[PDB]
Structure 1
Amino acid sequence: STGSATTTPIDSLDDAYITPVQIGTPAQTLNLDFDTGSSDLWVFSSETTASEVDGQTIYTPSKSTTAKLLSGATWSISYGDGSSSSGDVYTDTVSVGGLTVTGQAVESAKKVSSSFTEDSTIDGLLGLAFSTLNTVSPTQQKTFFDNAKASLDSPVFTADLGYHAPGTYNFGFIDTTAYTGSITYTAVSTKQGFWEWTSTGYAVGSGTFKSTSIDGIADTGTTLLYLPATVVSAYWAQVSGAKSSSSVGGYVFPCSATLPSFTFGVGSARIVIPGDYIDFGPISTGSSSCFGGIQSSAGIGINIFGDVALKAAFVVFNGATTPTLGFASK
């Protein structure tokens, strides 16, 4: 089997991407944030504290003839941005782009933190990291991809995120029309539960490529590109007037600037992020200070190849017995 679904930016800045997902019988379609950095499929629901729902579409398990309470199971997750959610668990039928998994754990939110409530466009998350990170207790549950894998034509999914435009998540096949050149594959460590890999270096604009190993994670659920402070300083030093602002929480730059590109290495191959992809717009409405799309990881503990980086590539998440990642230009 295969599946193919369009993923759409939630706003004009590509702050996140939503993909429609069918849950239950009859189908209830919710727009979920596909997140290769976590491993829970959780949704706003009829059980979510009413004051914490503000415009999201909810899953109502009582209206699904295939929903079954997973007795005794609870979940609770905290994300790197400080947001969180928790609740109980149903199993139900879940379909993405024509690919159907029966008995998928659907984690029903009883509580969500403010950033989730405040984002009316995101009805939940669909985790695509390794199932060892799944938070369901006392019986850990498998991700949608893990459950589908054996049925897929090939044990892979691909992320093709658009810049200010829709893109595609495919399951079970590699669309050879969706990229240019060849796909370069690179080793993955699953030791932390992430799609963790080592970039071979970087360049800023037309500058020379610096060969240096940068371990990080391919994370569709993180908006920006978080890299070591040395790398980030070298990038922003090429932008007149750019500075790190403690009050704003990162590098800002004059909105009048034209940003340089940023290149990252994948083995001997190179992925070029155009400068425009690094502009996240005014820090507040009407400001001439703009927020940068490349930020320091120094306070995180891990480097994160988020959407800013991934949207410049066609990315293969190869879930073979030994997982690997593939990157192609497009």
Structure 2
Amino acid sequence: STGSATTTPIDSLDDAYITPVQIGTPAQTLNLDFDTGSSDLWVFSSETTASEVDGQTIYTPSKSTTAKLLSGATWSISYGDGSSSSGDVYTDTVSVGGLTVTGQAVESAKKVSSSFTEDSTIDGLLGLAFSTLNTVSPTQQKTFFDNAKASLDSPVFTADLGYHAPGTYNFGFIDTTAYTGSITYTAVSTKQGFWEWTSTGYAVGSGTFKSTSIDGIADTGTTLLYLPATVVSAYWAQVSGAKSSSSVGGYVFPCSATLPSFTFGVGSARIVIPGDYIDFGPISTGSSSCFGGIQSSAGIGINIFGDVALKAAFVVFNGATTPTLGFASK
């Protein structure tokens, strides 16, 4: 089997991406944030505290003839940005782009943090990291990809995110019309539960490439590119008037600037992020100071190849016996 679904930016800045997901019988369609850095599929629901719902579409398990309470099971997740959610668990039929899993764990939120309430466009998350990170207790549950894998034509999924435009998540096949050149594959460590790999270096604009190993994670659920402070300083030094602002929380730059590109290495191959992908707009409405899309990882503890990086590439998440990652230009 295979599946194919379109993923769409939630706003004009690509602050996150949503993908439609069918849950239950008859289908209830919710727009979820596919997150290759976490491993829980959770949704706003008829059980979510009423004051914490502000415009989201909810899953109502009592209206699904295939929903079953997973007795005794609970979940609770604390995301690294400070967001959180928790609740109870059902199993139900879940379909993405025509690919169906029966008996998928659907984690129903009873509580969500204010950041989730405030994003009316995001109805929950669909985790695509390794199932070792799943938070359900006392019986840990599998991700949508792990449940589907054995049925797929090939044990893979791909991310093709757009810049200020829609893109695609595919399951079970590699669309050879969706990229240029060849796909370069690179080793993955699953020891922390992430799609963790090592970039071979970077360049700023038309500058020379610096060979250096940068260990980090391929994370569709993170908006920006988080890299070591040395690398980030070298980038922003090329932008007149850019500075690190402790009050704003990162590097800012004049909205009048034209930004240089940023290149990262994948083996001997190179992925180029155009400068415009690094502009996240005014820090507050009407300001002429703009927020940068490349930021230091120093406060987080791991480097993160988030959407700013991934949207410049066609990315293969290869779930073979030994997992690997592939990157192509597009």
Quick one: distance in 2 between partners of 1:188 and 1:280? Answer: 30
Pairwise CA distance, 1:283? 0.2
SS at match of 2:29: strand
Pairwise CA distance, 1:140? 0.3
SS at match of 2:91: strand
Pairwise CA distance, 1:106? 0.1
Question: What are the superposed Cα offsets for residues 205-259 of structure 1, whole Å, 9 maximum, x if unpaired?
Answer: 0000000000000000000000000000000000000000000000000000000
- What residue in structure 1 maps to residue 37 of structure 2? 37
1:167-246 equivalence runs, <5 A: 167-246=167-246
SS at match of 1:270: strand
Pairwise CA distance, 1:19? 0.1
Question: What are the superposed Cα offsets for residues 275-310 of structure 1, whole Å, 9 maximum, x if unpaired?
Answer: 000000000000000000000000100000000000
Pairwise CA distance, 1:169? 0.1
Pairwise CA distance, 1:203? 0.2
- What residue in structure 2 maps to residue 279 of structure 1? 279
Quick one: distance in 2 between partners of 1:124 and 1:71? Answer: 22
Quick one: distance in 2 between partners of 1:174 and 1:151? Answer: 16
Quick one: distance in 2 between partners of 1:116 and 1:23? Answer: 20
Pairwise CA distance, 1:54? 0.2
SS at match of 2:71: strand
Question: What are the superposed Cα offsets for residues 158-217 of structure 1, whole Å, 9 maximum, x if unpaired?
Answer: 000000000000000000000000000000000000000000000000000000000000
SS at match of 2:233: helix
Quick one: distance in 2 between partners of 1:204 and 1:91? Answer: 48
Quick one: distance in 1 between partners of 2:47 and 2:211? Answer: 51
Quick one: distance in 1 between partners of 2:321 and 2:301? Answer: 28
Quick one: distance in 2 between partners of 1:198 and 1:300? Answer: 17
Pairwise CA distance, 1:7? 0.1
Quick one: distance in 2 between partners of 1:78 and 1:160? Answer: 27
Quick one: distance in 1 between partners of 2:204 and 2:71? Answer: 53
Instruction: Give unmatched runs, 5+ long, in structure 1.
Output: none
Question: What are the superposed Cα offsets for residues 77-103 of structure 1, whole Å, 9 maximum, x if unpaired?
Answer: 011110000000000000000000000
SS at match of 2:309: helix
Question: What are the superposed Cα offsets for residues 100-158 of structure 1, whole Å, 9 maximum, x if unpaired?
Answer: 00000000000000000000000000000000000000000000000000000000000
Quick one: distance in 1 between partners of 2:281 and 2:12? Answer: 10
Quick one: distance in 2 between partners of 1:159 and 1:67? Answer: 29
Question: What are the superposed Cα offsets for residues 258-287 of structure 1, whole Å, 9 maximum, x if unpaired?
Answer: 000000000000000000000000000000
Instruction: Give unmatched runs, 5+ long, in structure 2.
Output: none
- What residue in structure 2 maps to residue 111 of structure 1? 111
Quick one: distance in 1 between partners of 2:128 and 2:224? Answer: 18
Quick one: distance in 2 between partners of 1:242 and 1:136? Answer: 44
- Give the alignment's TM-score, normalised by structure 1: 1.00
Quick one: distance in 2 between partners of 1:267 and 1:136? Answer: 37
Identity %: 100
Quick one: distance in 2 between partners of 1:80 and 1:3? Answer: 30
The ranges of structure 1 where at least 4 consecutive aligned residues each deviate by more than 4 angstroms after the TM superposition are: none
Pairwise CA distance, 1:321? 0.6
Quick one: distance in 1 between partners of 2:324 and 2:78? Answer: 26
Equivalent residue pairs, number: 330
SS at match of 2:300: coil
Pairwise CA distance, 1:38? 0.1
Quick one: distance in 2 between partners of 1:322 and 1:251? Answer: 38
Question: What are the superposed Cα offsets for residues 34-85 of structure 1, whole Å, 9 maximum, x if unpaired?
Answer: 0000000000000000000000000000000000000000000011110000
Quick one: distance in 1 between partners of 2:235 and 2:80? Answer: 24
Quick one: distance in 2 between partners of 1:306 and 1:298? Answer: 15
- Give the alignment's TM-score, normalised by structure 2: 1.00
